[PDB]
Design a protein around this motif. Structure first.
Motif, mmCIF file in Angstrom:
data_model
loop_
_atom_site.group_PDB
_atom_site.id
_atom_site.type_symbol
_atom_site.label_atom_id
_atom_site.label_comp_id
_atom_site.label_asym_id
_atom_site.label_seq_id
_atom_site.Cartn_x
_atom_site.Cartn_y
_atom_site.Cartn_z
ATOM 1 N N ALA A 1 0.831 -1.192 0.000
ATOM 2 C CA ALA A 1 0.000 0.000 0.000
ATOM 3 C C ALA A 1 0.870 1.247 0.000
ATOM 4 O O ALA A 1 1.866 1.332 0.723
ATOM 5 N N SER A 2 0.492 2.218 -0.830
ATOM 6 C CA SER A 2 1.137 3.531 -0.843
ATOM 7 C C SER A 2 0.418 4.366 0.204
ATOM 8 O O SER A 2 -0.499 5.131 -0.094
ATOM 9 N N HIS A 3 0.845 4.211 1.450
ATOM 10 C CA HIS A 3 0.098 4.661 2.614
ATOM 11 C C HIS A 3 0.900 5.679 3.408
ATOM 12 O O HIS A 3 1.024 5.570 4.627
ATOM 13 N N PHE A 4 1.439 6.683 2.711
ATOM 14 C CA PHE A 4 2.471 7.572 3.243
ATOM 15 C C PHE A 4 2.232 7.913 4.707
ATOM 16 O O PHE A 4 1.164 8.406 5.074
ATOM 17 N N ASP A 5 3.281 7.706 5.510
ATOM 18 C CA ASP A 5 3.344 7.475 6.965
ATOM 19 C C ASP A 5 3.105 6.006 7.293
ATOM 20 O O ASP A 5 3.018 5.655 8.477
ATOM 21 N N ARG A 6 3.000 5.140 6.288
ATOM 22 C CA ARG A 6 2.753 3.718 6.493
ATOM 23 C C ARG A 6 3.064 2.973 5.205
ATOM 24 O O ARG A 6 2.955 3.530 4.109
ATOM 25 N N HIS A 7 3.455 1.710 5.353
ATOM 26 C CA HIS A 7 3.627 0.799 4.227
ATOM 27 C C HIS A 7 3.061 -0.548 4.643
ATOM 28 O O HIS A 7 3.577 -1.174 5.573
ATOM 29 N N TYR A 8 2.008 -0.994 3.963
ATOM 30 C CA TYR A 8 1.182 -2.096 4.442
ATOM 31 C C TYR A 8 1.081 -3.168 3.369
ATOM 32 O O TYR A 8 0.613 -2.896 2.260
ATOM 33 N N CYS A 9 1.515 -4.383 3.701
ATOM 34 C CA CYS A 9 1.423 -5.533 2.808
ATOM 35 C C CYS A 9 0.214 -6.366 3.218
ATOM 36 O O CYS A 9 0.173 -6.906 4.328
ATOM 37 N N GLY A 10 -0.767 -6.469 2.323
ATOM 38 C CA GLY A 10 -2.013 -7.148 2.634
ATOM 39 C C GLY A 10 -1.889 -8.642 2.835
ATOM 40 O O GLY A 10 -2.822 -9.255 3.366
ATOM 41 N N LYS A 11 -0.768 -9.245 2.438
ATOM 42 C CA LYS A 11 -0.581 -10.679 2.616
ATOM 43 C C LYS A 11 -0.201 -11.023 4.050
ATOM 44 O O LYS A 11 -0.888 -11.813 4.704
ATOM 45 N N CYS A 12 0.887 -10.442 4.549
ATOM 46 C CA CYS A 12 1.271 -10.565 5.954
ATOM 47 C C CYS A 12 0.368 -9.643 6.766
ATOM 48 O O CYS A 12 0.732 -8.522 7.129
ATOM 49 N N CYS A 13 -0.830 -10.141 7.069
ATOM 50 C CA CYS A 13 -1.910 -9.345 7.634
ATOM 51 C C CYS A 13 -1.759 -9.120 9.133
ATOM 52 O O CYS A 13 -2.709 -8.671 9.782
ATOM 53 N N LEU A 14 -0.588 -9.424 9.699
ATOM 54 C CA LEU A 14 -0.370 -9.202 11.123
ATOM 55 C C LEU A 14 1.005 -8.625 11.436
ATOM 56 O O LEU A 14 1.319 -8.432 12.618
ATOM 57 N N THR A 15 1.828 -8.334 10.432
ATOM 58 C CA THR A 15 3.177 -7.837 10.668
ATOM 59 C C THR A 15 3.705 -7.206 9.385
ATOM 60 O O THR A 15 2.991 -7.084 8.385
ATOM 61 N N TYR A 16 4.975 -6.800 9.434
ATOM 62 C CA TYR A 16 5.701 -6.225 8.302
ATOM 63 C C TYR A 16 4.991 -4.978 7.762
ATOM 64 O O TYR A 16 4.424 -4.958 6.668
ATOM 65 N N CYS A 17 5.006 -3.940 8.591
ATOM 66 C CA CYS A 17 4.565 -2.617 8.177
ATOM 67 C C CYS A 17 5.702 -1.633 8.391
ATOM 68 O O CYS A 17 6.306 -1.603 9.468
ATOM 69 N N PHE A 18 5.997 -0.836 7.368
ATOM 70 C CA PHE A 18 7.054 0.163 7.434
ATOM 71 C C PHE A 18 6.445 1.544 7.630
ATOM 72 O O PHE A 18 5.467 1.905 6.969
#
Lengths: 124, 71
Positions: free
Chosen positions: B52-69
């Protein structure tokens, strides 16, 4: 299977690579497949959607291994996969197209089905 | 075991916001691709799924419980 057309080639490739689970139907499964190193064939059709995807598919197959075999009439290759299997060909329940299909490693182990590439590697 | 009375808010579920299907790539030229959002460096993920292009966040919908930048 068929008489090695540009069309009957898919007609023998499909009805067969579904049991290989190769036919990543739709455009999104197709992109997800060929973004990796799995793709071994691609298809297209007329532009019943935004004109920006016929750029993208051509561009992506070109980047790693282009194999685009453009056969128009989306509904044709749609009828060649359906949802899965058959009910009718006169089937008002669910008959829609695919507009792109990506086979994986040219499918289950096979004989005359390979001859599509034995033909269209050199003429292109 | 008695009947229910009129509620104040009741509403079932969200409606699966209908975004356009797939516009994650752009061409500088035919066969020269550019990618707006980065592909997630994950092992379980096949390196073909996006973030996700979630500026202030980076979210991967597959690892739905971890790995957010966070940037």
């Amino acid at each position: 299977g068929g008489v090695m057309d540009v069309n009957t080639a898919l007609q023998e490739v499909l009805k067969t690579a579904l049991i290989h689970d190769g036919l990543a139907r739709g455009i999104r499964e197709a992109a997800k497949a060929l973004d990796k190193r799995q793709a071994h064939l691609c298809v297209l059709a007329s532009n019943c959607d935004e004109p920006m995807y016929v750029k993208l598919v051509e561009a992506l197959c070109a980047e790693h291994q282009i194999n685009l075999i453009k056969v128009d009439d989306n509904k044709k290759l749609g009828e060649w996969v359906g949802l899965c299997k058959i009910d009718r060909e006169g089937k008002p329940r669910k008959v829609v197209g695919c507009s792109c299909v990506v086979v994986k490693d040219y499918g289950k182990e096979s004989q005359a089905k390979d001859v599509i590439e034995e033909y269209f590697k050199c003429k292109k | 075991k008695k009947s229910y009375t009129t509620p104040k808010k009741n509403k079932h579920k969200r409606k699966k916001v209908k975004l356009a299907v797939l516009k994650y790539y752009k061409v500088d030229e035919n066969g020269k691709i550019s990618r707006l959002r980065r592909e997630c460096p994950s092992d379980e993920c096949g390196a073909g799924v996006f973030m996700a292009s979630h500026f202030d966040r980076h979210y991967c919908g597959k690892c739905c419980l971890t790995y957010c930048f966070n940037k």
